[PDB]
Every structure is written in C-alpha cells, then in structure tokens.
Amino acid sequence: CSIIEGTGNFDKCVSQVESILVAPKLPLPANIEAASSGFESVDQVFRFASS
C-alpha cells in the first residue's frame, strides 16, 4: 500500500467501523478487563445489559 484515497461513502464507512471496531470477530487487543466483566466488544454491552 503506497497511497490512501478517500471515497466519501458513509454507509461503507459505518459497515467497516462496525466490523473492525464495534463488533469484531475477536476482542480488540489488551481488553482482558472488559472481557472479564463479560463484554468482549461494544456490540455486547447493550445486548447483555441495558438501562
């Protein structure tokens, strides 16, 4: 990868933020504390507890 070019596609951006950051396949690294409290990722927070 030489160059990064913007495509300005918000829905593709949301889709990627969801798969990479919010709901990843495995927890994002250095998150043993979150995992120990029962939450691997952001998507799990509102699934197991809500207020």
Next chain:
Amino acid sequence: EDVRKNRLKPLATYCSVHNPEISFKVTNEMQCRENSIDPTKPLAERMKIENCSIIEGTGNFDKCVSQVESILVAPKLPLPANIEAASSGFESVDQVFRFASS
C-alpha cells in the same frame, strides 16, 4: 448411562451454541472445540466419545503424566469457563509458577 451422572454433563452443558457465552464469543467456542466438544451438536453427541466402545488400561505412568500435562496442566488454549483465572493473568496451571512464585 444417566446424563445427570455423566462427568461431562457440566462441560457439555456450558459448551453449547445456545449459551450466549459461546454464541457471541468465538474465544469460548474455540476452547470447547479444543476439547473435542462441538457446541453446534446436540448434548448426547457433545458427551459422546465417538467410534469408541471400550476403554482399556495400559498402566503406563509416564504416558499418563504426558497426557495429564498436555490435556489438563498445560493445554494450548485455557480450559473452558476460566475467564476469572485468565483475568488475574493465568490461562493455565503451567503459567501460575512461571509468572509468580514464592
């Protein structure tokens, strides 16, 4: 033959795709699969030792130690339902004396 008396019932019950701890966490699913328990299968096949009719003793202590080490004491992945041990910094028994000692 009673399912409630089978020593695998607690583990096979934990290791289920219908348990949110397995269905939402690949981590836990992989720990189950590492101990030959497929969480996608019914309870009866999760507890079953496939294509095995008879267990025969060989009375070989060193082979026994070798297996207890690889299966129980130093497994590739932490044994299932051990988030508490892992959170305190220890995935398995072998890590306890490596990281801390007295």
